[PDB]
Design a binder for this molecule. Structure first.
Ligand SMILES: O=c1c(O[C@@H]2OC[C@@H](O)[C@H](O)[C@H]2O)c(-c2ccc(O)c(O)c2)oc2cc(O)cc(O)c12
Ligand SMILES: O=c1ccn([C@@H]2O[C@H](COP(=O)(O)OP(=O)(O)O)[C@@H](O)[C@H]2O)c(=O)[nH]1
Length: 453
């Protein structure tokens, strides 16, 4: 039988988009989806609704919280430092979520962050904490062994995996420092960030992750052993086709470059670089001599790209490079044959989009546990990309380190570049295998049926 699933993702494009990708896959299997979305954001989500008779948007009014800029709905509308206030606003949607669940009566609700399971169990609804970040990240930072150390969890503690963690990778000091401090910072309604997610893991009926057994398997198994409840895999949430074609201005411009020659650089929809690293990144792209498209917000303190560019940059780069601040159709650009290289911040969505395409992967993780852990998995486990070197303590890169990573992967004769191309091809062939996502979804849906039995 078909399930009625409500979707309540976090107010971030990187969550709304894969939740919608998955919603389309579920609706293709006949499941009815009630998709909760901030009101104004719905208009930008319609392009992805491929089953409007089965996927219905229900608007949420993102409530005022002091400090939240007026009208803000998504982390793409606020500075990164304001995310915790937006999380308070998500928390404050509880009354309109309660009303929506009582009138719609879904069997399951997929959610982020809102540690909701008390409400759903009162209503006879199953709660499903559905992560679109890597289970390797949640396992590394939010498994019980981490939380029981409470505020005795040090940067040195975070340099090693929690007890029983299934794999090995190295963090730099500044990354472990980042994880040790930001973990404690309130993220909505006075709740420390890692405590919030731990509460969700603890209180939810079941957990799910974007991913497949071949890659995410060991972490989902670890989390299932740790939290003693089902930890499902949706499949890798392969991007679905939008109803909107590639913007002709980008299509025309990209079409003027030789196949595989262009370096696409984008650091997601939330973050702003500081100026010095904005400069180093752009000068590093320039040093390669390849054409490039860099999708970047103006750096901290600046309101336009033009004002922040290194001196003489436009005049030197001429028509071979564009630095652009607006939202673009990233998935469609990564499919364009001109793109030979993706310099990515290693956001989980961007990783999948790179993996399913042909672009060589250059890993520029920004300071966020999921970006960093994605970068280590991609660079050291799957070995599908080359990571730009950062200072051990300062977390900064040089323009030369950017240059060298792009040069390595774009050089047909470079053995490391050939290696990551070959490994990327192996991973792409897995993710796109004719039965991989479908068999993941088969299992996913069977386990969801078990959840509501
Ligand atoms: O990056 C992280 C992340 O996602 C990010 O959390 C921070 C927000 O600002 C971003 O928009 C969001 O993508 C989440 C998260 C996402 C969805 C959830 O339901 C949830 O409980 C946690 O956990 C994390 C835990 C870490 O130890 C480290 C991280 O780096 C993240
Ligand atoms: O200008 C942009 C920036 C981002 N994205 C999409 O937004 C999502 C960003 O998610 P990700 O996890 O990569 O990073 P985040 O933006 O959450 O930091 C991905 O699907 C990108 O394709 C896009 O289409 N256009």
């Amino acid at each position: 039988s078909s399930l009625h699933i409500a979707m309540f993702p976090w107010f971030a494009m990187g969550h709304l988009i894969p939740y919608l990708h998955l919603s389309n896959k579920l609706a293709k299997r006949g499941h009815k989806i009630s998709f909760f979305t901030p009101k104004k954001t719905q208009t930008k989500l319609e392009q992805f609704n491929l089953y409007p008779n089965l996927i219905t948007f229900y608007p949420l009014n993102v409530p005022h919280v002091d400090g939240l800029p007026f009208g803000a709905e998504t982390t793409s509308d606020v500075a990164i430092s304001l995310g915790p206030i937006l999380m308070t606003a998500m928390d404050q949607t509880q009354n309109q979520i309660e009303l929506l669940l009582t009138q719609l009566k879904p069997q399951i609700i997929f959610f982020d962050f809102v540690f909701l399971p008390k409400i759903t169990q009162r209503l006879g609804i199953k709660s499903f904490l559905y992560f679109i970040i890597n289970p390797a990240t949640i396992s590394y930072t939010t498994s019980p062994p981490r939380m029981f150390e409470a505020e005795n969890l040090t940067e040195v503690d975070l340099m090693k995996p929690p007890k029983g963690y299934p794999t090995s990778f190295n963090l730099q000091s500044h990354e472990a420092k980042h994880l040790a401090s930001t973990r404690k910072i309130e993220f909505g309604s006075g709740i420390p960030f890692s405590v919030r997610s731990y509460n969700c893991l603890s209180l939810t009926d079941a957990i799910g992750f974007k991913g497949c057994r071949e890659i995410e398997g060991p972490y989902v198994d670890y989390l299932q052993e740790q939290f003693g409840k089902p930890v499902l895999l949706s499949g890798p949430v392969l991007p679905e086709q939008s109803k909107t074609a590639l913007d002709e201005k980008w299509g025309s411009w990209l079409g003027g470059f030789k196949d595989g020659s262009l370096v696409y650089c984008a650091l997601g929809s939330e973050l702003k670089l500081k100026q010095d690293q904005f400069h180093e990144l752009l000068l590093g792209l320039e040093l390669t001599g390849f054409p490039f498209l860099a999708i970047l917000k103006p750096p901290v303190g600046f309101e336009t790209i033009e004002d922040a560019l290194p001196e003489g940059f436009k005049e030197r780069v001429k028509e071979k490079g564009i630095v652009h601040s607006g939202w673009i159709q990233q998935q469609l650009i990564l499919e364009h044959p001109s793109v030979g290289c993706f310099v990515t911040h290693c956001g989980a969505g961007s990783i999948t989009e790179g993996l399913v395409n042909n672009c060589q992967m250059v890993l520029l993780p920004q300071l966020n546990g999921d970006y960093i852990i994605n970068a280590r998995i991609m660079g050291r486990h799957l070995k599908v990309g080359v990571e730009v070197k950062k200072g051990e303590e300062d977390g900064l890169f040089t323009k030369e380190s950017v240059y060298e990573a792009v040069k390595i992967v774009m050089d047909d004769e470079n053995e490391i570049g050939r290696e990551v191309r070959s490994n990327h091809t192996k991973v792409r062939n897995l993710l796109l295998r004719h039965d991989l996502e479908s068999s993941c979804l088969d299992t996913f849906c069977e386990k969801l049926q078990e959840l509501v039995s």
